[PDB]
Each structure stands twice: as structure tokens, then as C-alpha cells.
Amino acid sequence: CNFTELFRERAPTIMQYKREVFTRCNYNLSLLLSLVQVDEFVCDKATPEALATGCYSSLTVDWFAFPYAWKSYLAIGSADRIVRFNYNQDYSNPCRIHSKVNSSIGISYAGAYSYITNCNYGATNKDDVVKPGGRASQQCITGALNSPTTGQLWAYNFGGVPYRVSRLTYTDHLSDPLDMVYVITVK
Amino acid sequence: TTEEEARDFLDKFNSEAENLSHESALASWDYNTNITDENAQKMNEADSKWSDFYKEQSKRAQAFPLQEIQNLTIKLQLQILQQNGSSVLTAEKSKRLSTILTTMSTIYSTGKVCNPNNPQQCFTLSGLEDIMEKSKDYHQRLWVWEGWRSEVGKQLRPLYEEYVVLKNEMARGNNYEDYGDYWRGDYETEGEDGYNYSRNQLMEDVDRIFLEIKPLYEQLHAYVRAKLMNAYPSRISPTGCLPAHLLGDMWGRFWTNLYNLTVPFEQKQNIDVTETMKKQSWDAEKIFKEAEKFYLSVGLYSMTQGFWNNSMLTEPSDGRQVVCHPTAWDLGEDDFRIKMCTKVTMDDFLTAHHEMGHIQYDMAYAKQPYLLRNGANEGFHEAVGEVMSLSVATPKHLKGMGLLPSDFSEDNETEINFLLKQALNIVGTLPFTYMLEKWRWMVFEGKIPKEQWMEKWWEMKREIVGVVEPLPHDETYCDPASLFHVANDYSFIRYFTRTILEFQFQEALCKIAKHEGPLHKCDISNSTEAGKKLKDMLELGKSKPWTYALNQIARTKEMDAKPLLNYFEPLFSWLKKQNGNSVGWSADWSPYSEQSLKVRIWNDNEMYLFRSSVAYAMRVYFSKMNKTIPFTAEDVRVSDEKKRVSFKFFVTSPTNISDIIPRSEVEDAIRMSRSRINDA
Ligand SMILES: *[C@@H]1O[C@H](CO)[C@@H](O[C@@H]2O[C@H](CO)[C@@H](O[C@@H]3O[C@H](CO[C@H]4O[C@H](CO)[C@@H](O)[C@H](O)[C@@H]4O)[C@@H](O)[C@H](O[C@H]4O[C@H](CO)[C@@H](O)[C@H](O)[C@@H]4O)[C@@H]3O)[C@H](O)[C@H]2NC(C)=O)[C@H](O)[C@H]1NC(C)=O
Ligand SMILES: *[C@@H]1O[C@H](CO[C@@H]2O[C@@H](C)[C@@H](O)[C@@H](O)[C@@H]2O)[C@@H](O[C@@H]2O[C@H](CO)[C@@H](O)[C@H](O)[C@H]2NC(C)=O)[C@H](O)[C@H]1NC(C)=O
Ligand SMILES: *[C@@H]1O[C@H](CO)[C@@H](O[C@@H]2O[C@H](CO)[C@@H](O)[C@H](O)[C@H]2NC(C)=O)[C@H](O)[C@H]1NC(C)=O
Ligand SMILES: *[C@@H]1O[C@H](CO)[C@@H](O[C@@H]2O[C@H](CO)[C@@H](O)[C@H](O)[C@H]2NC(C)=O)[C@H](O)[C@H]1NC(C)=O
Ligand SMILES: *[C@@H]1O[C@H](CO)[C@@H](O)[C@H](O)[C@H]1NC(C)=O
Ligand SMILES: *[C@@H]1O[C@H](CO)[C@@H](O)[C@H](O)[C@H]1NC(C)=O
Ligand SMILES: *[C@@H]1O[C@H](CO)[C@@H](O)[C@H](O)[C@H]1NC(C)=O
Ligand SMILES: *[C@@H]1O[C@H](CO)[C@@H](O)[C@H](O)[C@H]1NC(C)=O
Ligand SMILES: *[C@@H]1O[C@H](CO)[C@@H](O)[C@H](O)[C@H]1NC(C)=O
């Protein structure tokens, strides 16, 4: 389809991950995997070969930068802060790709890449958990963007409702062939 | 023109007082919500600003004499702001009294008691109370009880005696007879007609009330004693006082923990619904929103949005440290919050209502002038919260609410178990509070000589409460200061009055709601008429005599145990059948007197030599056998004595404490060793 944006200089964070929906295209997965190397292909209810054969109504790809060592934190069944307050995966539609992208392909690595570690709210200390296929709320992100990188829990007031949020970076865990995560769902 | 300038002064005070109260109360809230040195500093600074404000205003307040004030609310507000308190003390005495107060608090707080036989195991106060509430070992319970008295009591003694004098001098500087009146003055008020109450009949009301609830306490005493005798065999006599260390706590203020040894119908389950609440998927918010539903169906106030947004209803898992002790907060500017760590339990279900009820009262008097924004008195605040708690504790509520099975029915065995547990909580503590303040008042007044403080403490305690010391004590001890409230200068009588008011309020409200049958089965849910009467009284705050507030809801200006006795009527009758003629107790007996010997007559050094000779005689008696016991003069215990006339004694093993060697054994131990008891 048009995958010139998937492999572009801006590499999105977990707190603010990016995605696209591709329609009315002839897919070319065999090039995507030739342009960048893949270390792991982990997918339920579908196979690496199945995704390369046949046309589908809609293709959705979500992506963000993320260190390999933390791969278990995106696992199904995980109760980690990374998956709970930022990126919940959609398991209602059949693939997590761990792919190192060579510095020869203009992808940069700049900015304090981060994810939300906590986002409570109200007198219930109720948590603000991200629904599968969704994104962290504007209120959680706005607070987190003004937090220290040391993970302190700070109070904010958003529209009359109190929130206690914290943010933690992983800006240090980078390599020239930076490790990125892509998630593919096929309709 | 005094009336007019006093008016302007108070209006000015009240305006800034509310603004500053908000800053201080909020800083304190934020600190407890989120614990850190930074917030502790903000809290301390905000509190310092408050004190400077209040103190400066109390200086100007002296320019507005009460003599020329005809308005009741100006009169009351000036009386509150004008008091000097500790400030009429000179700098030396003020500083010394503060130092003594702080030292007394510290000795109590970090007091420790170690195991006398195995002194590598030692407990802090909270560790000691855990042992004291749970153990059934007569020996362990005794060294915990006795240890605390010698480790903490005796260290507090030298401070209390100076303390009493300085507190009395402070009170005299405020135009009181002594410190007793300083405290009793919290109930004093002068209204119109019969709404005029003297601080000097508080003593009259508590003595009268105490006597009317004596029959109920005597029935409870005989029952608990008869049952407790099977937990601690041949330690407790058929008739007499209970040993202090077997009462289920460090001070014996509640018989709450004796319930498990005293259950009327032990095989029967009590009522709660913790398992049901989990099955029905309850949580914090549900628990509090259900409590609001209750207050609304009674006809009082609904909660504000700030409460639901601003409070702490659950324990956080964010990484923040907090203190979970339940407290209702009023931060000013009509900002009402609850700070509690709620979980799906019967205890939190009912506590949530208690804290909610305090807020309902806080709202009602919000309309009052700043200094008058409190309840009618010390007792009304909790008395109201307790009534509103009883209303939902009852299974009548729990069933109507849909939490209990609709096939749920109330047995006449379950009724007895419930009432006894309540009696151990209420009936059992009433005599403790009464006796403590009875003694305390006499000490500050000056009716008990310093040298007779402990003598009267234990004599009076056996007469009123029916508790006796496992071991005799000298005047080096001061067991009264063993309790937090004495050591830290708190009034205790509020615990007596809140109970009496609680039942006066409950009964009047039930009658208004047209309740028929026993009061312990009363409910005020879906009774707007009972709701309206309660609201009118709560709204008064301190603008009227507390006897006025009492008259509106209970139709009298005096306190009566009348309603308490009716609450427990079915228990009284049940206990009577169980106790027969074992009703009441004697104050002649003590745990160590049965085996004592009497000595007829004397210097303290001669008493030492006597005790040394007795210890020697015991050593010789045992030496003849093949058991060696290292008895010393210290192991001979001396009972109440009459100087230069007579004394009594007994001896115990240095490695057990709880044991007393039988009179006959001690007596011929002395006879065998009759020779070689001479000197020079
Ligand atoms: C538990 O308790 C602690 C201690 O009180 C709280 O810590 C404070 O949290 C607040 C936020 O609620 C912080 O306020 C913010 O400070 C930012 C600047 O930080 C630097 O400078 C300060 C000194 O002033 C240093 O202490 C700090 O380390 C940094 O070097 C501001 O940029 C923020 O501005 C935002 O609000 C203003 C409002 O006027 C807007 O105009 C701005 O555009 C922006 O939105 C803000 O002022 C405060 O600095 C923290 N204190 C300390 C010592 O660090 C915890 O937050 C609290 N936690 C919870 C859950 O209650
Ligand atoms: C938490 O509070 C919000 C709003 O707070 C109020 O409005 C703010 C602007 C500020 O002035 C606060 O001090 C006020 O207390 C509540 O949201 C409202 O909910 C009602 C429904 O009950 C709705 O009709 C209003 O339009 C909402 N207002 C806004 C601004 O959104 C929210 O319900 C409160 N949370 C809870 C559990 O009650
Ligand atoms: C608080 O203490 C002050 C003294 O510091 C009391 O004021 C004195 O009262 C007496 C008796 O009326 C007067 O003779 C003095 O001249 C007053 N001194 C001053 C500086 O005003 C004040 O009455 C006390 N207030 C209360 C409520 O007890
Ligand atoms: C009174 O008896 C009850 C049992 O009916 C005790 O409750 C137990 O307390 C322990 C903690 O010490 C828990 O581990 C048990 O699970 C509780 N049992 C049940 C059935 O819940 C209660 O502690 C006793 N109270 C006193 C003062 O001894
Ligand atoms: C990345 O560069 C290395 C040389 O350092 C090369 O061997 C590797 O094949 C390149 N990866 C891709 C996907 O082209
Ligand atoms: C007393 O003062 C208050 C104002 O604080 C006023 O509302 C009330 O009517 C006054 N009562 C009398 C009898 O003057
Ligand atoms: C009060 O009345 C309501 C009906 O409006 C009912 O649902 C509720 O259970 C009643 N409360 C009690 C304690 O019976
Ligand atoms: C309960 O009622 C039964 C009669 O149905 C009676 O025999 C029993 O003694 C009563 N028990 C109590 C504690 O009142
Ligand atoms: C104290 O003596 C009793 C016998 O009355 C015995 O059961 C208990 O174990 C002894 N305790 C110690 C510490 O010797």
C-alpha cells in the first residue's frame, strides 16, 4: 500500500503511539520484511505465512519504539504498567513484530521516549485503564507530559476532576539499529 | 455602644477565621493524603499562621467585656475567644508544664515491656496489646499487665505529681476552683428559664446515672465472672472482683474481648454479610453511596460533588503513604470530605455510616458563626453518630436493603448474643469512665493526699468497677497515668455522656417514627418525621445551651440512663435468670490475700530485714528437698500496711511471678527457720 510513513524519521512513543488504516491497496508484506529485519514474529490465531497471502478488506497497523528486553511487558495476560495505562492490544481480530531498523533508513531516536506508569482519579483512586485498540486519555497524557522523568506521582486538575499521574522514560535504551514494535491486525 | 463594637469585632474575626481555617485544614488534609517532608512543612507553616491570628485576636477580645453584652451569640463567641488558658502562667511555669506534658506523652508512647524469664523477646505497646487481647495464658497476661505498670507507670509518677499542681494553678488563673472545674466547665451554660446548667452538677448527674445502670452492670459482672472462671480456673472466686489482667486489655476499659469466653449461645452463628457483599460485587463507592441513600431516606442532607471527587474512600496503591485511621473532615468553605481505607467488610460498611453521619452534623451547623460551629457539647458529636450507626447495624435494615436472605429471621438466641456484645462494649465501659474521672476530679480538687493516690485508686476501683490488682502496689506507682488519656491531658467523661445521650436520642427518634416493639429493633429509614426532628437540633450548634438541644429531641433538660436500660431490657432479664443470687460482688477479696500471713508490730530498714528473713526461711524449707529456689527479700510482697501497727505479706517464685506459695508452706518455712533470725 503506502508504507512510506511506517518507516519515517518520527518514531512514536508508547504514551502517544501512532496507527494507520490501509484500504483500497494491493498489500506488499514481502517488501516490508525485506526493508527491515525481524527478530520475532509473535501472533495468535494467524501465521506469518497467512498474512502474506490473499487480500483483506482492511489492514490496520499500530506502532511505537520499544526496547527488546521489555518484550514480556506487551504479552497477553500481562498486568504491567506499560500495557495497562497505555497500549492494550486488540485480540478480537488476528501480530506483534519485533523489528530492528538499520540507521541507513532515516529513522531517528530523539526525545524522552516514555510511557505512563500510573493515572488514578476521583475519591476512589479508580484507575484509568486503556481499552484494547484505544489510547491513553488526554487527561492522563496531559498530566504525564508535565511530570518528572523520575516517576514522581503528581496531582493535576482536569475539568474539575483530580488525577494523580506519573511518567517513566526509556530514552536510554537505544541502539543505532533501534528496536521498534509494530502490531498488525487483519480484517 | 459595647454591643455594637463587639458585633463588628466578631464579624471581622469570623471572616478571616474561616479563610485561615481553610488554609490550615487543607494543608493538614493534603499532608495526610500524601505523606512527605514538603507537605509536613506546609502544614506546620499554615498552623503557625493560624495560631498567630487566633492569639492576636484573643488580645483584642479583652476590649469587649461580657458585662455589657445582651446578645447571646456575641456573649458566647467572646467567651470562647477571650479565654487565657496556659497564658496566665509565668514563663517558667508555662515552659515547665509544656516540658512535663511532652515527657509524659513520650514515656507512655515508646514504653516497652520485656519478658522477665526470656529477655530477648520484648514488645512495644502495640505488641503488648496484641498479646493482651489474644493470649489465654494467665502467666503471660500478668507479666504484660504488671510490666507496663512498672516500666511506664512508675516513670510517669514523678511527673504527674508536679503536673497536677501546675494544671490547678492554670485553672485558678482562669477563675476556676481547680483543674476539675476547668474541664467540667465545658458543660456550663447560662440561658433563660430552666436552660441554665452548672458545671458543678456534672458530678451530680454522673453519680445519679451511674447508680441507675448499676443493676445492669452487676448482672453483667456476675455472668462474665461465672463464665470467665472456666477460662482461668481457681484464679477467680465465685463471688468477688475480676483480676485486672484477665479483662481482655491493658487497662480493662472494655470487656469487648471477653465475649468469646462468655457467649450465651456459642454454637449459633452471629449476623454479618461480608460473604454476601463479596458475592454481590460491592466496593468502596457502593458502600458510601448506599450510606448516602440512607441519610436521604431519613430526610437529612445529600453529599456534595467535592466529596466524591476530593475524598479518600479507598486505600491507594499508587506508591503514596497514608494513614488509614477513619476521620471525617471539615475543611471550611462547606468542603466536606472523608478519609478512610474502605474494603468489603461489615466493619467498614458500618464505619462508613459513622463518618458520613459526622458530616451530616457538620453541615447542619455550618450556618453558625465560626466559633459556634461545633455540636452542643463534647458528647453530642459522637452520640449522634452512634445512633445513626445502630440504625443500620440492625438486620431489619440489612434485610429491607436486600443484603440478607428474605427468609432471614431473628432468633431469640441471636438477640441475646447481640445484646451481650453491646453490653460488654457499653455497660462494661461506663463504670470505667465514671470511676476514672471520679478519682481524677478528687485528685485535682485536693480531696486525696498525694501519699494516698494509689491507695484510693485501687480501693475505689474495687468498689465501683469490681476490678482488683493481681499484685499490691506502692505509692511509687501511678496506674492512672498508664492510660493515654491521663498521660496526654484529655477529658475522659465524654465517653460516659455520649453513651447516655445516644440512647436518649435514639429512643425519642423511634417514638417520633412511630416504632413499636423493643428499641434494639428500631429503624429510622423511611421516617422523614424522625429525620426532621434530628435536623432541627443538629443545626443549633453551640448557639444554644446543650440542655436546649437535648430538650428539643428528647423532651428533657437532664441526662437519664432511662433509655439505656430499655435498650438492654431483654439482656437484663436473661442475665438475671443466669445469675440468680450471684448478683454483684464483694470488695474484700483479692487474688493474693488468701495465702497471706499477718505481721504484728517500724523502719523501712526493718521491713527489709523482715523480708530478707522470710526469703531465707523459704530457701531453707526448699533446701531440705532437692529443689533450689533463689528467694530474696525482693520476692516477698507486702500488702496494704498500717504504719507501726501491722502489715500482711506473701511470697512468690522469682522465676514465675504468677505463683503464690500457700500460707501453710510459708508459715512453717518460717517456723523451721525460727532460729538464727537474730543480729548484732
Ligand atoms: C505530593 O506532594 C508533593 C509535594 O508538595 C507534590 O509535589 C509538587 O507537585 C506540584 C504539582 O502538583 C509541582 O508544581 C509544578 O512545578 C513545576 C516546576 O517544577 C520545577 O521547579 C520546582 C520549584 O518551583 C521544583 O521543586 C521542581 O523539582 C522542578 O525543578 C511547574 O512547571 C508546574 O507548572 C504547572 O502548573 C502551573 C500552575 O500555575 C501552570 O501555570 C503551568 O503551565 C503548569 O501547568 C507546577 O507548578 C511542585 O513543584 C511539586 N513540589 C516539589 C517539591 O517538587 C506531589 O505532586 C504530590 N503528589 C500527589 C499525588 O498529590
Ligand atoms: C466531579 O466533579 C465534576 C464537576 O465539578 C463541578 O464543576 C467544576 C467545574 C467545579 O466548579 C467543581 O468545584 C464542581 O463541583 C462532576 O461533573 C458534573 O456531573 C453532573 C452530573 O451529576 C453534570 O450534570 C455536570 O454537567 C458535570 N459538570 C462538569 C463540569 O462536567 C462529577 O460528576 C463529579 N464526580 C462525581 C463522582 O460526582
Ligand atoms: C486574661 O488575662 C488578663 C491579664 O493579662 C485579664 O485582664 C486583667 O483583668 C483584671 C480584672 O478585671 C484587671 O484589673 C486588669 O487590669 C486586666 N489587665 C489587662 C492587661 O487588661 C483578663 O481579664 C483575662 N481574661 C479572661 C477571660 O480571663
Ligand atoms: C474470637 O473468635 C474468633 C473466631 O470465631 C476469632 O477470629 C479469628 O481471628 C484470627 C486472627 O487472630 C483469624 O486468622 C481467623 O480467620 C478468625 N476466624 C474466623 C472464623 O474469622 C477472633 O480473633 C477472636 N477474638 C479474640 C479477642 O480472641
Ligand atoms: C543492517 O546493516 C548491516 C551491516 O552493519 C547489514 O549486514 C544488515 O543486513 C542490514 N540490515 C538490513 C535490514 O538491511
Ligand atoms: C443576636 O445577634 C445575631 C447576629 O450575630 C442576630 O442575628 C440576632 O437576631 C441577635 N439577637 C438578639 C436578641 O439581639
Ligand atoms: C425504604 O423504602 C424504599 C422504597 O422507596 C425501599 O426500597 C427500601 O428498602 C426501604 N428501606 C428499608 C430499610 O426498608
Ligand atoms: C426462645 O423461645 C423458645 C420458645 O419458642 C424458648 O423455649 C427459649 O427458652 C427462648 N430462648 C431465649 C434465649 O429467650
Ligand atoms: C508457674 O506455675 C504454674 C503452676 O501454677 C505453671 O503451670 C507455669 O508453667 C509456671 N510458669 C513459669 C514461668 O514457671
Author numbering:
A (entry chain B): 386 to 479, 481 to 573
B (entry chain A): 21 to 621, 634 to 712
What is the paper's account of this structure, in its own sentences?
Here, using a pseudotype virus entry assay, we found that NeoCoV and its close relative, PDF-2180, can efficiently bind to and use specific bat angiotensin-converting enzyme 2 (ACE2) orthologues and, less favourably, human ACE2 as entry receptors through their receptor-binding domains (RBDs) on the spike (S) proteins. We determined the cryo-electron microscopy (cryo-EM) structures of the PDF-2180 spike trimer as well as of the NeoCoV and PDF-2180 RBDs bound to Pipistrellus pipistrellus ACE2, revealing a binding mode that is distinct from that observed for SARS-CoV-2 and NL63. Cryo-electron microscopy analysis revealed an RBD–ACE2 binding interface involving protein–glycan interactions, distinct from those of other known ACE2-using coronaviruses. Our structural analysis indicates that NeoCoV and PDF-2180 bind to an apical side surface of ACE2, which is largely different from the surface engaged by other ACE2-using coronaviruses.
3D classification revealed that the NeoCoV RBD–Bat37ACE2 complex primarily adopts a dimeric state with two copies of ACE2 bound to two RBDs, whereas only a monomeric state was observed in the PDF-2180–Bat37ACE2 complex. We determined the structures of these two complexes at a resolution of 3.8 Å, and C2 symmetry expansion was performed for the NeoCoV RBD–Bat37ACE2 complex to further improve the resolution to 3.5 Å, enabling a reliable analysis of the interactions involved in binding. Thus, we used the NeoCoV RBD–Bat37ACE2 complex structure for detailed analysis. The RBM folds as a four-stranded anti-parallel β-sheet (β6–β9) and exposes its tip surface for ACE2 engagement. The NeoCoV RBM inserts into an apical depression constructed by the α9 and α10 helices and a loop connecting α10 and β4 of Bat37ACE2 through a network of electrostatic and hydrophobic interactions involving the tip of the RBM four-stranded β-sheet. Polar interactions are predominantly mediated by residues Asn504, Asn506, Asn511, Lys512 and Arg550 from the NeoCoV RBM and residues Glu305, Thr334, Asp338 and Arg340 from Bat37ACE2. Moreover, the methyl groups of the NeoCoV RBM Ala509 and Thr510 residue side chains are packed into a hydrophobic pocket formed by residues Phe308, Trp328 and Leu333 of Bat37ACE2. Moreover, the Bat37 ACE2 glycans at positions Asn54 and Asn329 sandwich the strands (β8–β9), forming extensive interactions with RBD residue Trp540 and to a lesser extent with Asn532, Leu539, Ala541, Gly545, Gly546 and Val547 from the NeoCoV RBD, underpinning virus–receptor associations. As expected, the mutations N511Y and R550N in the NeoCoV RBD, which abolish the polar contacts and introduce steric clashes, resulted in a significant decrease in RBD binding and viral entry. Moreover, the Bat37ACE2 N54A mutation (abolishing the N-glycosylation) and NeoCoV W540G/N532G substitutions (eliminating interactions with the glycan) hindered binding.
